[PDB]
Amino acid sequence: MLLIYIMLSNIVVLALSVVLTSSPFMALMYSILLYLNVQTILWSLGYDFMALIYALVYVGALAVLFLFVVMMVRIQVSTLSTKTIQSVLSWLAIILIFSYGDVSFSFPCGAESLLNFGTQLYSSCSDLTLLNSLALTIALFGSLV
């Protein structure tokens, strides 16, 4: 329970660190740590395959593309530090306003089965998977040109 709470609470700090830092490379590192913490949150809800998917697709592949771009477009963004006290508390107040008093539901634990998930992906929800494949094909054809 303490471990679950620590992860749920750490997600917000790892999200704040991304926007606050002025270096695009450092924000990517913070985002990778955020993605791992999201894997860890999904473990508490009972998902292993889905939490694996988040790490494989995002940490494994997407971050590599982001960092490839970041080195290619390398720019001097160490111009100045504008992180005055007045700005940071304003950001925190905005965040508190948005994330307060929303409807909360008891924390669930749900065991998943990739047998059932596979059967549904390829029998009943087969319309979904083929359209996702079409979207991937669109992205491939568009990005390569």
Binding site: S124, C125, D127, L128
Partner: protein
Amino acid sequence: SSLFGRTEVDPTGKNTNRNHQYLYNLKVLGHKTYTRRDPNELQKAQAEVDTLSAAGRLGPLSPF
């Protein structure tokens, strides 16, 4: 399907408008409906179980 569906007319006219979600859930998932056992039936069966237990014919509730 679960996500997508198209709509066609019936030349015969026998089939009519019904909720497509309800029909789809009946066909793919199915509806489980349960009754409630009448008290007099339950009392007789429970008394029979207790009577056999008192005679010693039935086994223990816990093995150890």
